[PDB]
Ligand binder design. Structure first.
Ligand code: 2TM
Lengths: 1112, 113
DNA sequence: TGCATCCGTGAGTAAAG
DNA sequence: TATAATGGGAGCTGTCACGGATGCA
């Protein structure tokens, strides 16, 4: 088809590498390609330099580190449930100070997980993503005091867990306090410890409103630095013996130790810029020549007094400004956990250094690598920011990699997050998308990196702008922080240009976010594109400018939920971003150089390049993702094709010829339909199932272990007791189901026998045995069957056995068997559909084609959306899309409509006119006039003011078609819909919330250990929670008996539930219940707290609910 | 009034603080068992330090540690630092925590189930 | 008799996890 | 069962409002 595109804004630069935040952060933190001598003091190298040397006398010093090659490649790690990682070696040397002996060795510290090409990780076989974290940037801030208006708080914040917060405050009594580790003491003492004298403080602070006198204390200057230092140590350590070296050590570690105190390099820069000073290191003070020398404290006190008095050039700081919030990317977070593991390793090192035969101590004899290994393994397996990767579709993974969280280790606790953090700050413009955030509890705390945004080396988010000199728009692009951005008048990207010159007299621009009408002389920069304000997902919404933000959010988020369809299509209306998303997500395959295609296969493509070399690309085929969606690549070239560099070789999942294909293009009619699309429900045509639209492949993994027992071994076997051949039909010789079988609920996938628990058969069992003369077998059936409501076709079996090459299982297990079951899911009643504009609904009715409203030429519509979903939601974009889709149906073309820069109404009307010609002149030629029903609809439309009276039938139908509306016939009667109906092509996705996965029911099943109440969850065959509020509902109805059932017979009245089941299977009425077991647990847990709880009768005489079983 | 002081400390039935083999042969267990073990180790060492006539600093230390053991058993976290298992920041779950809160016995298993 | 100040405690439901 | 050895490390922090007990002037 033809791809017409709209838009008048040329984009100077393309979108940056969309996963660059992840990949570049980790590359910087590892420096694996840098030869050791050339490394910078950043990342894990900086961690090493911080931990080493290790002293006390012996010394252990660090020369360099090196990362070897991964023991196994990525696919092998995914299969074997291994971590994709590199060995970490560190070259260390021991030195005895007195002996001078120097022993040197390269010691092995374990493994570090490597990041894959697309910016993800493979931990224990499952892909994971480390989510960037947003936090308050280190530095010196000045905030208003919420109690005292004319007073201000000075706060000095280092990196997370790199020192204490320090507050300076002007008390009501005039003295300046310093809060540290929650201890308020007069700052004057610490100023004295720094070597400051009353002369210097008087000449430095005398200018300010006599405030310096609140700093004047005679008893402090009466003592030298040492006496003030000991005074401070006593004020900070009640009870600790105030030794001299003890106090020096404590104060140094608190204020000047670069191994304990650390502003970020960003904290360093921001303190320098705020206080107008220069810093030597990243600490507040230093230890020089035996004494303490100030760096930050006096500048901070000066700024504080100046802001308090009111001298100009001093302002309180906005702590939600994106010049004061920075991002902690993958590399920084992993480096922090690495630094903690290193600290523990160093503690162990000194521990072993003190003792031990000091004649023979090598580096290998001093390093226990286990604490470091454990810290890294913890970070990657159980951190709040280490998330199971979302790979429902490729856009899922991309969005996941580009998400920013304010939660997690070092971040905010929920319910401790007011409006301020969750607001979209003015400085979010161009940096953090304003719509892509969750609805619910996390709103405003999980966000997305804007599409043109990059994170600089200091961790602040930067957005690009064009330079504007004398009304001329250069192609020089400048990436700014929000602090930098606030200095300029920045025009809007849509301001009209002739050539490179601003062609408008009045220009819409921003100054510190404030919108302002300005002349071209005043314009300093200009936005790169509207695309730079929104996330990648939001940038996939055509006609975004016509959609209320609350529904754009939903459509944005729900693209992440789209299921790869076997016949997926790209939308007939695109934003122009659908190809970059496929490319950057590493979904599809591309040609590495110009070449001719040698071989093409369902499994592999072989290319001959210009170098004469033969390169073979294997194709991933029907692979199971974290969410169970199928990830297969299909080849799109043919034998002998000439391909240039970057040409498509294979379509990934949810890709159609390199275009992001998250759903189907269906033909939509927007009208009610007999209530079956009431309140967002959707009606679809069976023709969609017929031609396998909205059909998706899903793979489930089942796993079983056979382990050694104290009662004998489990074993995977075909020899399972008490089962017919009917039950064992599709099981191979070894007991594992055969590839290709169709497995339904209850079918065995893997046979297994377990030795019975020690048991004397009840006399009933003995007599039944004697009657039937059959010994009870030693083992019992413990086979892995298909769970309720699941099944499909077996496609893979993995078997690992102890004693087999390359295989070693965890202690105890003899063998492990995994079965992969595929299923082809057609759309069904209950599945969820949605479009990119926030219109979502669940398929409620699938009609046969002859019931579907059809166009006069016999063509039935695909889905019927209800118009009542539009006005309240204000997502008119889906309407315009539909209109354009209509034209595209008959012209046979697709469109690219950039957001805010796309197709307008007149151009859609031109296209619709052309389409109407194709739609109706065909009819007029084929020898048919206007239909009687068309005349009746035209009369109705004429009364509605939709067509002008006195025009011909064809002219009026053309008028309606220009409004996007057509005549529509009811399939059930052949009479027309009394009005003309909006019909057109819409892009609709099938979301991951399919009813096959959610339907669940239970009569009886597993109970919990202590509570004896049903387990929860479909996987546990669990019961529904009938919680406090459901109880209130039953109470308010006065359903005393229904409620008592919930509380006893159906949950944890043991005797009650047993007796109820027996009565029902016998056909009797259920018995009166008795005490719920969890109340007995309450009585006993109160007894465990030395509280006697006694059930009495009306005579105040005790009643035993334990039936004597616990009274001696 | 003196009953607000404990001489004999009660021990919950073992099924209410199980030691169960999970599917696969490993063991899972309630935190009350580690709290009771702390208590019993410190109490036994106190009985031995008494029988062996120890100085006053030592018996005082033992008695302080015993009071805090009981406190952690009953209302861990209430006074002082909360007792944690080795190699984890998670507080152990005492009897008060079992009784109260959103996940406590009343709201989780008695007023709804 | 009155205030500041500190400590303890609670902050939605179901689902999956 | 015997050189002598003699006081510890980790804090970690963007609510919030109320209610009730303690602390000062
Ligand atoms: N965190 C959450 C998320 C969802 N819910 C429940 O799910 C519904 C969402 O309403 P809704 O937003 O879907 C109402 P909508 O259909 O958009 O507009 P309308 O008024 O024109 O009908 C609510 O009625 C809640 O009871 C909740 O309790 N807590």
């Amino acid at each position: 088809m033809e791809i017409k595109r709209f838009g008048r804004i040329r984009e100077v630069i393309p979108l940056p590498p969309l996963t660059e935040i992840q990949v570049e952060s980790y590359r910087r933190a590892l420096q694996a390609d840098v030869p050791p001598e050339k490394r910078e003091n950043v990342g894990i190298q900086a961690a090493f330099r911080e931990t080493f040397p290790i002293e006390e006398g012996l010394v252990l010093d660090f020369l360099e580190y090196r990362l070897g090659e991964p023991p196994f490649p990525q696919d092998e790690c995914r299969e074997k449930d291994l971590t994709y990682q590199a060995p970490l070696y560190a070259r260390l040397q021991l030195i005895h100070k007195d002996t001078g002996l120097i022993k040197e060795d390269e010691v092995f510290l374990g493994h570090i997980p490597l990041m894959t090409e697309d910016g993800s990780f493979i931990i224990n076989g499952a892909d994971r993503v480390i989510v960037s974290q947003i936090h308050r940037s280190p530095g010196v801030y000045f905030t208003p005091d919420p109690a005292r208006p004319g007073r201000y708080i000075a706060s000095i914040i280092p990196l997370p867990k790199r020192g204490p917060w320090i507050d300076l405050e002007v008390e009501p009594n005039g003295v300046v306090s310093m809060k540290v580790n929650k201890r308020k003491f007069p700052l004057v003492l610490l100023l004295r410890v720094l070597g400051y004298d009353q002369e210097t403080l008087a000449r430095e602070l005398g200018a300010y409103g006599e405030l310096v006198q609140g700093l004047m204390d005679e008893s402090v200057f009466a003592m030298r630095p040492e006496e003030a230092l000991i005074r401070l140590f006593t004020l900070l350590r009640p009870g600790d013996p105030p030794k001299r070296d003890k106090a020096v050590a404590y104060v140094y570690g608190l204020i000047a130790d670069p191994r304990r105190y650390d502003l970020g390099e960003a904290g360093r820069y921001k303190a320098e810029e705020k206080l107008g000073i220069r810093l030597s290191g990243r600490t507040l003070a230093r230890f020089e020549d035996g004494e303490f020398k100030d760096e930050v404290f006096l500048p901070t006190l000066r700024y504080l007094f100046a802001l308090t008095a009111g001298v100009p050039g001093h302002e309180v700081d906005d702590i939600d400004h994106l010049g004061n919030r920075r991002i902690r990317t993958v590399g920084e977070l992993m480096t922090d956990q690495f630094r903690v593991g290193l600290a523990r390793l160093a503690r162990g090192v000194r521990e072993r250094m003190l003792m031990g035969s000091e004649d023979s101590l090598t580096p290998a004899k001093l390093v226990n690598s286990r604490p470091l290994e454990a810290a890294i393994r913890e970070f990657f397996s159980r951190s709040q920011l280490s998330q199971f990767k979302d790979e429902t579709n490729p856009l899922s993974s991309l969005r996941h990699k580009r998400r920013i969280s304010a939660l997690g280790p070092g971040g905010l606790t929920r319910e401790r997050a007011g409006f301020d953090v969750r607001d979209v700050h003015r400085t979010h413009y161009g940096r953090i998308c304003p719509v892509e955030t969750p609805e619910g509890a996390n709103i405003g705390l999980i966000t997305s990196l804007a599409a043109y945004a990059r994170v600089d080396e200091l961790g602040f988010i930067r957005t690009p702008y064009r330079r504007v000199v004398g009304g001329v728009v250069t192609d020089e692009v400048v990436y700014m922080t929000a602090t930098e951005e606030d200095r300029y008048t920045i025009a809007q990207a849509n301001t009209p240009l002739e050539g490179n010159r601003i062609a408008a007299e009045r220009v819409v621009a921003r100054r510190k976010g404030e919108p302002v009408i300005v002349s071209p002389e005043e314009v300093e920069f200009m936005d790169v594109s509207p695309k730079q304000v929104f996330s990648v997902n939001t940038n996939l919404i055509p006609f975004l400018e016509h959609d209320d933000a609350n529904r754009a959010l939903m459509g944005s988020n729900m693209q992440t939920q789209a299921v790869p369809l076997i016949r997926a299509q790209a939308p007939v209306v695109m934003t122009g971003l659908e190809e970059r998303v496929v490319r950057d997500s590493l979904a599809a395959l591309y040609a590495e150089e110009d070449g001719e295609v040698a071989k093409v296969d369902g499994n592999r493509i072989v290319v001959r390049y210009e170098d004469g070399r033969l390169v073979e690309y294997p194709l991933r085929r029907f692979y199971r993702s974290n969410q169970g969606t199928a990830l297969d690549q299909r080849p799109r070239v043919v034998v002998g094709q000439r391909v240039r560099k970057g040409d498509l070789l294979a379509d990934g999942p949810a890709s159609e010829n390199g275009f992001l294909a998250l759903g189907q293009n269906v033909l939509v009619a927007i009208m009610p339909f007999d209530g079956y699309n009431f309140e967002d429900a959707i009606v679809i045509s069976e023709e969609l199932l017929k031609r396998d639209f909205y059909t998706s492949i899903h793979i489930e993994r089942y796993e079983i272990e056979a382990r050694d027992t104290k009662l004998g071994p489990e074993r995977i076997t075909r020899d399972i007791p008490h089962l017919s051949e009917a039950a064992l039909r599709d099981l191979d010789e070894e007991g594992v189901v055969r590839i290709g079988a169709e497995v339904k609920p209850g079918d065995i996938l893997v046979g297994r026998t377990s030795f019975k628990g020690e048991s004397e058969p009840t006399p009933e069992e003995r007599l039944l045995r004697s009657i039937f003369g059959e010994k009870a077998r030693d083992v019992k059936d413990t086979s892995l069957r298909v769970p309720p409501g699941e099944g499909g076709i077996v496609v893979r079996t993995v078997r690992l056995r102890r004693g087999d090459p390359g295989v070693e299982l965890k202690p105890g297990v003899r063998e492990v068997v995994r079965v992969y079951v595929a299923q082809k899911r057609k759309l069904q009643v209950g599945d969820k559909l949605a479009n990119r504009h926030g219109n979502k609904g669940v398929v409620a009715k699938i009609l046969p084609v002859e019931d579907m409203p059809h166009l006069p030429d016999g063509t039935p519509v695909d889905v019927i959306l209800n118009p009542l979903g539009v006005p309240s939601r204000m997502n008119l974009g889906q309407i315009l899309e539909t209109h354009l889709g209509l034209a595209g149906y008959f012209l046979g073309q697709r469109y690219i409509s950039p957001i805010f820069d796309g197709a307008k109404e007149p151009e859609i009307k031109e296209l619709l006119a052309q389409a109407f010609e194709v739609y109706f002149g065909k009819r007029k030629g084929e020898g048919f006039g206007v239909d009687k029903r068309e005349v009746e609809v035209l009369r109705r439309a004429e009364k509605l003011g939709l067509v002008t009276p006195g025009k011909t039938p064809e002219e009026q139908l053309k008028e309606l078609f220009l409004q996007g509306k057509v005549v529509l016939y009811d399939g059930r009667t052949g009479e027309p819909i009394e009005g003309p109906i909006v019909v057109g092509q819409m892009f609709i996705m099938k979301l991951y919330h399919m009813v096959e996965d959610k339907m669940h029911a239970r009569s009886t099943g597993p109970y919990s250990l202590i509570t004896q109440q049903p387990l929860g969850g479909k996987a546990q065959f669990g019961g529904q929670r009938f919680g406090e509020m459901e109880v209130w509902a039953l109470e308010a109805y006065g359903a005393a008996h229904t409620l008592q059932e919930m509380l006893t017979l159906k949950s944890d009245d043991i005797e009650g539930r047993n007796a109820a089941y027996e009565a029902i299977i016998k056909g009797e009425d259920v018995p009166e219940p008795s005490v719920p077991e969890s109340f007995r647990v309450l009585v006993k847990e109160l007894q465990a707290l030395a509280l006697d709880v006694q059930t009495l009768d009306e005579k105040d005489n005790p009643v035993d609910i334990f039936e004597g079983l616990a009274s001696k | 009034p003196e009953w607000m002081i404990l001489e004999a400390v009660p021990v919950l039935p073992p099924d209410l603080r199980p030691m169960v083999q999970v599917d696969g042969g490993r063991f899972a267990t309630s935190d009350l068992n580690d709290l009771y073990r702390r208590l019993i180790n410190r109490n036994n060492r106190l009985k031995k330090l008494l029988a062996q006539g120890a100085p006053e600093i030592i018996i005082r230390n033992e008695k302080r540690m015993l009071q805090e053991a009981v406190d952690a058993l009953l209302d861990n976290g209430r006074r002082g630092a909360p007792v944690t298992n080795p190699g984890s920041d998670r507080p152990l779950r005492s009897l008060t925590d079992i009784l109260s809160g959103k996940q406590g016995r009343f709201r989780q298993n008695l007023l709804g189930k």
